[PDB]
Structure 1
Amino acid sequence: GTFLFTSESVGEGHPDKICDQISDAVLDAHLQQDPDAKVACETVAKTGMILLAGEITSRAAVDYQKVVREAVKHIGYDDSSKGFDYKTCNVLVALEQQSPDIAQGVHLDRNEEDIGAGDQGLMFGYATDETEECMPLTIVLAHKLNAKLAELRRNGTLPWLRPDSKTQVTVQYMQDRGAVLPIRVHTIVISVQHDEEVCLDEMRDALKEKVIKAVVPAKYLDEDTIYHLQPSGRFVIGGPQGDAGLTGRKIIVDTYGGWGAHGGGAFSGKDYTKVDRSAAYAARWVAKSLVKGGLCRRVLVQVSYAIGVSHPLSISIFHYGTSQKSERELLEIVKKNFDLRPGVIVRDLDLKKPIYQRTAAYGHFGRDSFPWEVPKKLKY
């Protein structure tokens, strides 16, 4: 009755994640001056280059050079020896206004609560009682391994570390009436960019003793656990120099690590009218509210929209057999307790607030008591 499941995460200096963080730094900079900014900011990263491309209509006056370079500085790319330097990279901007055709169909001359969805699309929310924060253990552990690397880099105890990292965790689970119960960690992968002087053995020993053991409870690690630590053997070239980055290329890291489902939309760089983000956050909030409210142990919520239409076109609930109530009954509870129009989600989840850069590494869910992580008390 057991099975394996694998999830991955990446660090703050992973090139795709750099782009997500820059896109959300730009969004936050606009929102600080104009809470109603319309933002659709993609970031592209390659050796020596950050390019911003997309559509922004905003009353803000934003210094893109400063916003980009400060985000890169925070990540830790501050010297040519590391492969990338915020002080001296190229920042290119190809930003236009939002299409007037979109604007007129979505939000122009519309009451805020009745704004249309900014696009069509589908979105999912997921929650699992296997951890207190209602997230899959595989992805929680993967994120925490990347966060530990950044901590040990920033505090100087492993000064050979660089910002670009990836981790991957495979857990053996037991089925339990539709819920899932973690048993043990089967395999861990860690790859992290490093300086030219440190040797493989020093790195592998540190990754096991100072990273894995500082993150993963010993009860999950045993004589059979497989470790792939610096499996490529050499990772000196990294960041955008090693691999181009783009916004919205870590959408599974951003969400549930392969569990649940995904509708395809990226989060970073987008204001609340883009339901790819706001409705996914709302669907997480619904799912977590159902689990924390004791109605389910595990649940998947789908919603979908049409551009220009406020109310979702469809709402669906799948409880994996982990509720006494039928999925039909849960759907009625959701419809009674939640209003998933984007112009209402924005009020419930406070989505004009410039907190987005904080969401753009280590997953958008399961951390920090963001509004979508605070369950709603359900009436039924």
Structure 2
Amino acid sequence: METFLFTSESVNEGHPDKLCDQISDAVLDACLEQDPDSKVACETCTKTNMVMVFGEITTKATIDYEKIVRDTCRSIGFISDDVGLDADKCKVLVNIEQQSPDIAQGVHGHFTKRPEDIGAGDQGHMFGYATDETPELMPLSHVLATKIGARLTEVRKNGTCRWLRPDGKTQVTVEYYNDNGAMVPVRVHTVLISTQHDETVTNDEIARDLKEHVIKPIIPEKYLDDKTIFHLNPSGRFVIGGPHGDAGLTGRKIIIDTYGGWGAHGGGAFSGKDPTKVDRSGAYIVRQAAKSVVANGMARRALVQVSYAIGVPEPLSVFVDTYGTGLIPDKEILKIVKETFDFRPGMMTINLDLKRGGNGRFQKTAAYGHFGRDDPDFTWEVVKPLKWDKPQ
């Protein structure tokens, strides 16, 4: 049986880049809760004892940027210089201005353009992907790395591993077989975790606890064997973490946000962006398309690209590829996708309910990936029925 090794990583919510995504999306949530028509382009960065929120917001909302920043950091567990950032000591810089009027006239006519006439908030390209290899129609390498990172957070919060600190990363190498273009996981080859820790725990205790409390409960037993490789805190010490160890920025985890290196990426970040930014609304809709093609049994795997021009409602290009797993030709799947899905940003916003913030609607997307989640707020995970001649 010929196989190959494919690797995906993740980080948890205490990773300093993920912190920035969550602050950017906490700001988006706060704007939309008061003004659903908010134009939001909120970037965040962090380093030792410093968070800065910067970029462009036009909102009728009254927003306390400082509070949102400190509250977000506090909830993730950045509550002392000892764990790499103190939410209640750190400098909070704010360099927020209104959206460029040159952008605003072209995109939405300063909040006068009707939904079907709203232009793309910028140019770019976006991909959606789905694979039948997991029930959430996501790649197993990604899913396993992601769920391990979430389990790492959970055993700190639930008091199972009292020695953990917020900042952690994971990486899973899966051995795969190609079944007529479909991806069939064989076994997990290598599992890696690097997690921040206090000074009370030995490397033997870290290794024991990570294997028993974190990795074993998440990876299906059928994928683990006596030859599976384990790298557990390979640096040998990870006491210094969060912004103290490593500068964070919004949009530096776009592959961890998406498909772990499977499918494709157009390069646009998600977090801190209102849905006129097709970086977000476009990627969500082409995930809905890719997932719908696979969930309807039209294909075992699907990749969809869309592209846009700033100020133009209609996409410049659309493609569908099923890696030869389609039960009808890709040209016919492309025709069905284009008849079923409205790629116009004004339409995507309403059709996926993307102007709703609050109850951390977008903050939830900013850690543990945007795709393959079952929370009803993830509206682009809802499968659309597709009209086709489905085999008996």
Task: Give 1:272 deviation, angstroms.
Answer: 0.4
Note the alpha carbon deviations across 1:341-369, whole angstroms, 9 max, x for none: 00110111100011100100000000024
Q: Which residue of 2 aligns with 1:358?
A: 364
Following the alignment from structure 1 to structure 2, what is the Cα–Cα distance between the partners of residues 359 and 292? 22
Partner of 2:157: 154
Matched AA of 1:95: I
Counterpart pick for 2:351 among 337, 348, 353: 348
**1-structure distance, mates of 2:146, 2:101:** 40
Distance 2:317 2:15 in 1: 35
Per mean C-alpha deviation after superposition, the further-off stretch among 236-245 and 368-377 is: 368-377
1:123 positional shift: 0.3
Partners of 1:346 and 1:293 in 2: CA distance: 24
Partner of residue 267 from structure 1, selected from 262, 266, 270: 270
Correspondence for 1:293 among 286, 291, 296: 296
1:13 partnered with 2:19: no
Q: Deviations over 1:125-151 (max 9, x none)?
A: 000000010000111111111111111
* Structure 1 residue 119 displacement after superposition: 0.2
Report how far residue 335 of structure 1 moved.
Answer: 1.1
Residue equivalent to 2:50: 49
Q: Report the residue type matching 1:121 in the other structure.
A: G
Q: Deviations over 1:248-300 (max 9, x none)?
A: 00000000000000000000000000000000000000000101111111000
The residue matched to 2:327 in structure 1 has which SS? coil
Question: More deviation in 322-331 or 52-61?
Answer: 322-331
Q: Distance in 2 between matches of 1:113 and 1:153?
A: 47
- C-alpha displacement of 1:89: 1.1
Amino acid at match of 2:311: G
- Give the percent of matched residue pairs that are identical in Structure 1 and Structure 2: 66
The C-alpha deviation readout for 1:174-201, integer Å capped at 9, x for no partner, is 1101001111000011000000221111
CA deviation digits over 1:278-336, x for unaligned, max 9?
A: 00000000000101111111000000000000000000000100012111101100111
1:57-77 CA distances to partner (integer Å, 9 max, x unpaired)?
A: 000000011111111111111
User: CA–CA distance in 2 between the matches of 1:51 and 1:263?
Assistant: 26
Q: Which residue of 2 is the match for residue 143 of structure 1?
A: 146
Distance 2:28 2:345 in 1: 18
How far off is 1:379 after superposition? 2.4
- In the alignment, the residues of structure 2 paired with residue 173 and residue 12 of structure 1 have an alpha-carbon distance, to the nearest angstrom, of 29
Structure 1: distance between partners of 2:224 and 2:269: 34
Of the structure 1 ranges 77-86 and 144-153, higher mean CA displacement relative to structure 2 is found in 77-86
| SS at structure 2 position matched to 1:156 | coil
Q: 1:186 aligns with which of 186, 189, 192?
A: 189
Rounded Cα–Cα distance in structure 2 between residues aligned with 1:203 and 1:158: 9
Contiguous gaps of at least 5 residues in structure 1:
none
Instruction: Give the match's secondary structure for 2:334.
Output: helix
> After superposition, where does 1:180-219 map in structure 2 within 5 Å?
180-219=183-222
Alignment-mate amino acid for residue 38 of structure 1? K
AA partner of residue 37 (structure 1)? S
Q: Letter of the 2:42 partner, please give it.
A: C
One-letter identity of the residue aligned with 2:61: A
**1:214 Cα deviation after fit:** 1.3
Counterpart in the other structure of 2:325 = 322
1:373 aligns with 2:374: no
Please name the residue that 2:130 is paired with. 127
The code of the aligned residue for 2:366 comes to A
Secondary structure of residue in 1 paired with 2:187: strand
Distance 1:249 1:83 in 2: 19
Structure 1 residue ranges, 4+ long, deviating more than 6 angstroms after superposition: none
More moved, 368-377 vs 165-174: 368-377
Equivalent of 1:236 in 239, 242, 246: 239
Q: Does residue 337 of structure 2 align to residue 331 of structure 1?
A: no
Looking at structure 1, the residues matched to 206 and 144 of structure 2 have their Cα atoms a distance apart, in angstroms, of 20
Give the number of equivalent residue pairs.
380
Distance in 2 of aligned mates of 1:141 and 1:90:
36
Q: Secondary structure at the match of 1:286?
A: helix
* Bigger mean CA offset, 51-60 vs 363-372: 363-372
Deviations 1:220-241 (A, max 9, x none): 1111111000000000000011
For 1:251, the aligned partner's letter is I
Q: CA deviation at 1:80?
A: 2.2
2:87 maps to a residue whose letter is Y
Equivalent position of 1:98 in the other structure: 99
Q: Aligned partners of 1:211, 1:8: CA distance in 2, in Å?
A: 15
- Letter of the structure 1 residue corresponding to residue 341 of structure 2: F
SS of 1:296 mapped into structure 2? coil
- Counterpart secondary structure, 1:21: helix
d(CA) in 2 for partners of 1:49, 1:283: 36
Amino acid at match of 1:43: T
Residue 305 of structure 2 corresponds to which residue in structure 1? 302
Distance, in Å, in 2 between the alignment partners of 1:67 and 1:75 is: 12
Aligned residue for 2:160, secondary structure, equals coil
CA distance in 2 between partners of 1:123 and 1:100 (Å): 26
Q: What is the one-letter code of the residue matched to 1:335?
A: K
What amino acid is the match of 1:330?
I
Q: Which consecutive residues of structure 2, in runs of 5 or more, have no partner in the other structure?
A: none
In 2, the alpha carbon distance for the partners of 1:83 and 1:343 equals: 41
Structure 1 residue identity aligned to 2:188: V
Q: Does 191-200 or 23-32 show the bigger shift?
A: 191-200
